[PDB]
Design a protein around this ligand. Structure first.
Ligand SMILES: [Zn+2]
Ligand SMILES: [Zn+2]
Lengths: 265, 261
């Protein structure tokens, strides 16, 4: 057996407590004035509330409080301009609150559950089963073809933003099989020369991006219109509107562009 | 999420491989994964979900307990890797369904989606998809040597590499650095991703790395580890078996210490 990480249990907040406060409910958190709350606990009417410590940021605790405020409840995407490591802790808070909420009852036997005192787990009052937060591994892949890169627009958001291909890994498959399968299903092409670049959590709602680069091998772009509005090869020096700087998708595109410059220029 | 072909009742003229799973075990009569006609295995009338295809013949999940030869999927690890991966998927999907008979949000009974591997609630709008546990595993190199450690979990005699679950809101790279520090007290450098593998014990996705020693002295976490030490690539102790990603990373780290020295 491999064990999950040990963590401090929740407790009642006092006046002397302080830090960043991720006050969350149903995939949202409190952003008073569009900002992540920071300061002493009385400043935010949180003294007497239960809070879970979910991290530390530059000497200061990061706290999860499970409550819904009347106003200024938003997506964590609103504080994406924050330092990455802080943003990652705010996402952690949002996800942990959904974990707890998703586990009020035990799915094995239907009885009420209660938090573990030593780890981020839900224990059952009736049976021996338990659950840990669900992270959904997700591949994302920049596909290079000579001096070009495959960029797509999703049929969902008419943003005008052309990005790479992404999709959830399925049970029983490797990352490399997920890459190959998602690309096929989304665009009809077979890829080769897969290369892992990096990973990033992505709390929308609970993904872990595993980022790859790959080369065109064979096939015609045949897009699934339910997933994709369009997909085309764009030359490295002639790109459309891309994902923001900071996103793993922009990082992959830039990497691909950089090695087209090193070969064809 | 990905769409899938729905479940259905097996007929006499149904065939393929059968993952007949209940409570984390599957049916392995005489130690073998059932292949052939449904009727040979008294499987007609049962529900099945096709979980894949192996060499032009379907792989089916049947959720049922047999009297004999219920065993761990580890017992079929000798099979081709892609057949082992599908047997593990069946085991994992049976445990997913079992783990979601009731909804965790509202407590009402759930029912399977027909358009994907999901459980939907009879009362509320909430949903669950199968849980996959990203787990890092790292072979640490230091010059002509590799870090191997014995685990407290089972007195195996086996010396293997370091592994741990990725936490919520951390990268694979951060997970590697933290686990190695927590378990062995050392800082590593030049992290390289090698590969991944599903590992259905119960539901892990191994992401395999190689790393180099940077600093620190070996100080073990005595709850997780019995002992840890550096080992010459020409003088290795007992290792995990050659059907594991652990053995692959050790062989890879040993293959390039053979080169340089
Ligand atoms: Zn229970
Ligand atoms: Zn429900």
């Amino acid at each position: 057996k491999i064990h999950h990480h040990h963590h401090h249990m929740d407790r009642i907040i006092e006046k002397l407590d302080h830090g960043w406060w991720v006050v969350s409910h149903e995939q949202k958190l409190w952003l008073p004035k569009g900002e992540l709350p920071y300061g002493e606990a009385a400043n935010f009417d949180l003294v007497g509330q239960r809070a879970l410590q979910i991290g530390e940021w530059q000497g200061e605790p990061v706290w999860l409080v499970q409550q819904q405020r009347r106003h200024d409840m938003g997506s964590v995407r609103q504080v994406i301009d924050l330092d990455v490591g802080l943003f990652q802790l705010a996402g952690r808070g949002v996800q942990l609150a959904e974990f707890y909420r998703s586990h009020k009852y035990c799915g094995y036997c239907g009885h009420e559950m209660y938090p573990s005192k030593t780890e981020w787990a839900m224990l059952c009052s009736h049976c021996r089963e338990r659950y840990y937060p669900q992270i959904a591994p997700c591949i994302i892949v920049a596909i290079r073809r000579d001096d070009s890169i495959l960029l797509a627009q999703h049929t969902r958001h008419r943003n005008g933003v052309h990005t790479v291909l992404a999709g959830f890994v399925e049970v029983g498959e490797t990352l490399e099989q997920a890459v190959a399968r998602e690309v096929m299903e989304e665009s009809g092409i077979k890829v080769k020369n897969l290369r892992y670049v990096t990973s990033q959590p992505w709390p929308f709602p609970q993904s872990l991006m595993t980022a790859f680069m790959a080369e065109y091998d064979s096939g015609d772009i045949v897009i699934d219109p339910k997933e994709l509005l369009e997909a085309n090869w764009y030359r490295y020096d002639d790109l459309p509107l891309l994902p923001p700087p900071g996103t793993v998708a922009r990082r992959l595109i830039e990497d691909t562009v950089a090695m087209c410059r090193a070969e064809y220029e």
